[PDB]
Motif scaffolding. Structure first.
Motif, PDB file in Angstrom:
ATOM      1  N   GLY A 217       0.791  -1.217   0.000  1.00  0.00           N
ATOM      2  CA  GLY A 217       0.000   0.000   0.000  1.00  0.00           C
ATOM      3  C   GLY A 217       0.827   1.273   0.000  1.00  0.00           C
ATOM      4  O   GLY A 217       2.047   1.237  -0.167  1.00  0.00           O
ATOM      5  N   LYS A 218       0.160   2.407   0.189  1.00  0.00           N
ATOM      6  CA  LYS A 218       0.853   3.686   0.196  1.00  0.00           C
ATOM      7  C   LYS A 218       1.518   3.990   1.532  1.00  0.00           C
ATOM      8  O   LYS A 218       1.173   3.415   2.568  1.00  0.00           O
ATOM      9  CB  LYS A 218      -0.101   4.821  -0.185  1.00  0.00           C
ATOM     10  CG  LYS A 218      -1.293   5.019   0.735  1.00  0.00           C
ATOM     11  CD  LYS A 218      -2.146   6.172   0.209  1.00  0.00           C
ATOM     12  CE  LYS A 218      -3.344   6.472   1.099  1.00  0.00           C
ATOM     13  NZ  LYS A 218      -4.120   7.644   0.575  1.00  0.00           N
ATOM     14  N   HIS A 219       2.487   4.898   1.481  1.00  0.00           N
ATOM     15  CA  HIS A 219       3.236   5.305   2.656  1.00  0.00           C
ATOM     16  C   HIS A 219       4.038   4.134   3.216  1.00  0.00           C
ATOM     17  O   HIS A 219       4.344   4.083   4.407  1.00  0.00           O
ATOM     18  CB  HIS A 219       2.281   5.873   3.705  1.00  0.00           C
ATOM     19  CG  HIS A 219       1.528   7.076   3.233  1.00  0.00           C
ATOM     20  ND1 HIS A 219       2.156   8.234   2.819  1.00  0.00           N
ATOM     21  CD2 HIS A 219       0.200   7.301   3.100  1.00  0.00           C
ATOM     22  CE1 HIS A 219       1.248   9.118   2.451  1.00  0.00           C
ATOM     23  NE2 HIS A 219       0.052   8.577   2.612  1.00  0.00           N
ATOM     24  N   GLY A 220       4.375   3.196   2.338  1.00  0.00           N
ATOM     25  CA  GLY A 220       5.158   2.046   2.745  1.00  0.00           C
ATOM     26  C   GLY A 220       4.427   0.899   3.424  1.00  0.00           C
ATOM     27  O   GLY A 220       5.084  -0.004   3.946  1.00  0.00           O
ATOM     28  N   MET A 221       3.095   0.923   3.452  1.00  0.00           N
ATOM     29  CA  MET A 221       2.349  -0.177   4.069  1.00  0.00           C
ATOM     30  C   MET A 221       2.960  -1.471   3.525  1.00  0.00           C
ATOM     31  O   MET A 221       3.208  -1.595   2.316  1.00  0.00           O
ATOM     32  CB  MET A 221       0.875  -0.130   3.669  1.00  0.00           C
ATOM     33  CG  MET A 221       0.156   1.154   4.019  1.00  0.00           C
ATOM     34  SD  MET A 221      -0.379   1.211   5.737  1.00  0.00           S
ATOM     35  CE  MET A 221      -2.045   0.502   5.600  1.00  0.00           C
ATOM     36  N   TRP A 222       3.209  -2.431   4.409  1.00  0.00           N
ATOM     37  CA  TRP A 222       3.791  -3.688   3.978  1.00  0.00           C
ATOM     38  C   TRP A 222       3.227  -4.912   4.689  1.00  0.00           C
ATOM     39  O   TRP A 222       2.573  -4.804   5.732  1.00  0.00           O
ATOM     40  CB  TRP A 222       5.311  -3.650   4.159  1.00  0.00           C
ATOM     41  CG  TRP A 222       5.757  -3.356   5.564  1.00  0.00           C
ATOM     42  CD1 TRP A 222       5.992  -2.126   6.111  1.00  0.00           C
ATOM     43  CD2 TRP A 222       6.010  -4.309   6.599  1.00  0.00           C
ATOM     44  NE1 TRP A 222       6.378  -2.254   7.427  1.00  0.00           N
ATOM     45  CE2 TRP A 222       6.399  -3.585   7.752  1.00  0.00           C
ATOM     46  CE3 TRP A 222       5.948  -5.710   6.667  1.00  0.00           C
ATOM     47  CZ2 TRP A 222       6.725  -4.211   8.956  1.00  0.00           C
ATOM     48  CZ3 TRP A 222       6.275  -6.335   7.865  1.00  0.00           C
ATOM     49  CH2 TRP A 222       6.660  -5.581   8.994  1.00  0.00           C
ATOM     50  N   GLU A 223       3.475  -6.072   4.091  1.00  0.00           N
ATOM     51  CA  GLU A 223       3.065  -7.364   4.632  1.00  0.00           C
ATOM     52  C   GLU A 223       4.226  -8.323   4.384  1.00  0.00           C
ATOM     53  O   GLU A 223       5.108  -8.038   3.573  1.00  0.00           O
ATOM     54  CB  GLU A 223       1.827  -7.915   3.917  1.00  0.00           C
ATOM     55  CG  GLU A 223       0.548  -7.124   4.099  1.00  0.00           C
ATOM     56  CD  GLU A 223       0.192  -6.872   5.560  1.00  0.00           C
ATOM     57  OE1 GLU A 223       0.310  -7.795   6.401  1.00  0.00           O
ATOM     58  OE2 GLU A 223      -0.227  -5.736   5.867  1.00  0.00           O
ATOM     59  N   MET A 224       4.242  -9.437   5.109  1.00  0.00           N
ATOM     60  CA  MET A 224       5.268 -10.454   4.924  1.00  0.00           C
ATOM     61  C   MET A 224       4.657 -11.336   3.838  1.00  0.00           C
ATOM     62  O   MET A 224       3.596 -11.930   4.045  1.00  0.00           O
ATOM     63  CB  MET A 224       5.471 -11.282   6.202  1.00  0.00           C
ATOM     64  CG  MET A 224       5.873 -10.482   7.435  1.00  0.00           C
ATOM     65  SD  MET A 224       6.156 -11.517   8.910  1.00  0.00           S
ATOM     66  CE  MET A 224       4.631 -12.345   9.013  1.00  0.00           C
ATOM     67  N   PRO A 225       5.313 -11.431   2.670  1.00  0.00           N
ATOM     68  CA  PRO A 225       4.831 -12.241   1.538  1.00  0.00           C
ATOM     69  C   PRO A 225       4.567 -13.696   1.895  1.00  0.00           C
ATOM     70  O   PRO A 225       5.329 -14.299   2.648  1.00  0.00           O
ATOM     71  CB  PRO A 225       5.958 -12.121   0.509  1.00  0.00           C
ATOM     72  CG  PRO A 225       6.631 -10.831   0.869  1.00  0.00           C
ATOM     73  CD  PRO A 225       6.641 -10.867   2.375  1.00  0.00           C
ATOM     74  N   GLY A 226       3.492 -14.253   1.344  1.00  0.00           N
ATOM     75  CA  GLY A 226       3.167 -15.645   1.596  1.00  0.00           C
ATOM     76  C   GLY A 226       2.182 -15.920   2.718  1.00  0.00           C
ATOM     77  O   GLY A 226       1.550 -16.977   2.737  1.00  0.00           O
TER      78      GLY A 226
END
Ligand SMILES: [Mg+2]
Length: 267
Positions: A217-226
């Motif tokens: 997402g925006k502003h660097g929103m992140w998740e751990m892939p998988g």
């Protein structure tokens, strides 16, 4: 991310933040005091509910009292609640996945962000009023594990009492609607950045544990892939917990293997 809201009232607040049902999955609230204001009051470590409640009423163990009773009602605003929410993949791995180091990483990232928030601490001293930097706050951090939709969500409620020490005396935090020079106004204007700071700090640690991250997402929103975030997006704590574990097993995701791949890939 970092949500901002005013703390309702002293009593119900006390009950909400320390209500066992809000941290049943975590098993612990992991509450602690924080802020230079807290060290000055001698408040460290675990948070006693009566002291926390009286603090929200404007009554300090210091003996200072900012309560203003007007016919049974206290007009001293309790303070603010800054909530730091971890990304869904981290919450799942931490609470359902077994990796407790991520809870600790979440705390350290929150601790880091809250320090930068404290720097905006200020009080209004009308000599025409004006805001003067104070640099100290009294805070209580509480960990909860469930979102409004009943999905797994590691988040810390950073409650900022409406008090601050200026030239020895304890005063209320700055409020400047017009010039937006008040403490809370300065927080709102940096909401995104603070949530960003917390996310970045958490990201460095999770990656040092061998975990991968990916911007979703925006502003660097992140998740751990998988991680099957999808499965958790769209009354009795024990039953809710059993459900989370059940829908996870049905995703076919092999949590342990995911953890080992991170380990054999770290250091
Ligand atoms: Mg909560």
């Amino acid at each position: 991310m970092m949500s901002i809201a005013q703390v309702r009232s002293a009593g119900s607040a006390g009950n909400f933040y320390t209500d066992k049902d809000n941290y049943y999955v975590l098993g612990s609230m992991g509450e602690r005091w924080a802020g230079r204001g807290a060290e000055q009051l001698g408040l460290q470590g675990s948070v006693d509910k009566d002291v926390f409640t009286r603090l929200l009423e404007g009554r300090l163990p210091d003996g200072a009292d900012l309560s203003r009773m007007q016919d049974g009602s206290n007009r001293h605003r309790p303070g603010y609640d800054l909530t730091f929410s971890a990304p869904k993949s981290v919450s799942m791995m931490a609470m359902l996945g077994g990796d407790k180091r991520l809870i600790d990483a979440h705390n350290q990232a929150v601790d880091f962000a809250v320090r930068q928030v404290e720097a905006l601490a200020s009080t209004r001293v009308m000599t025409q009023s004006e805001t003067v930097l104070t640099g100290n706050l009294v805070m209580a951090l509480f960990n909860h594990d469930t979102s409004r939709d009943q999905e797994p969500q590691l988040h810390t409620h950073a409650v900022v009492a409406n008090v601050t020490q200026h030239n020895g005396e304890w005063k209320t935090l700055s409020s400047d609607k017009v010039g937006k020079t008040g403490f809370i106004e300065n927080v709102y204007a940096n909401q995104i950045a603070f949530g960003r700071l917390y996310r970045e700090k958490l990201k460095e640690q999770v990656e040092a544990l061998g975990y991968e991250t990916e911007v979703v997402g925006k502003h660097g929103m992140w998740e751990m892939p998988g991680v099957p975030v999808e499965a958790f997006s769209g009354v009795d704590p024990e039953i809710k917990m059993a459900e989370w574990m059940q829908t996870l097993k049905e995703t076919g995701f092999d949590i342990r293997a995911y953890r080992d791949a991170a380990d054999q890939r770290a250091d």
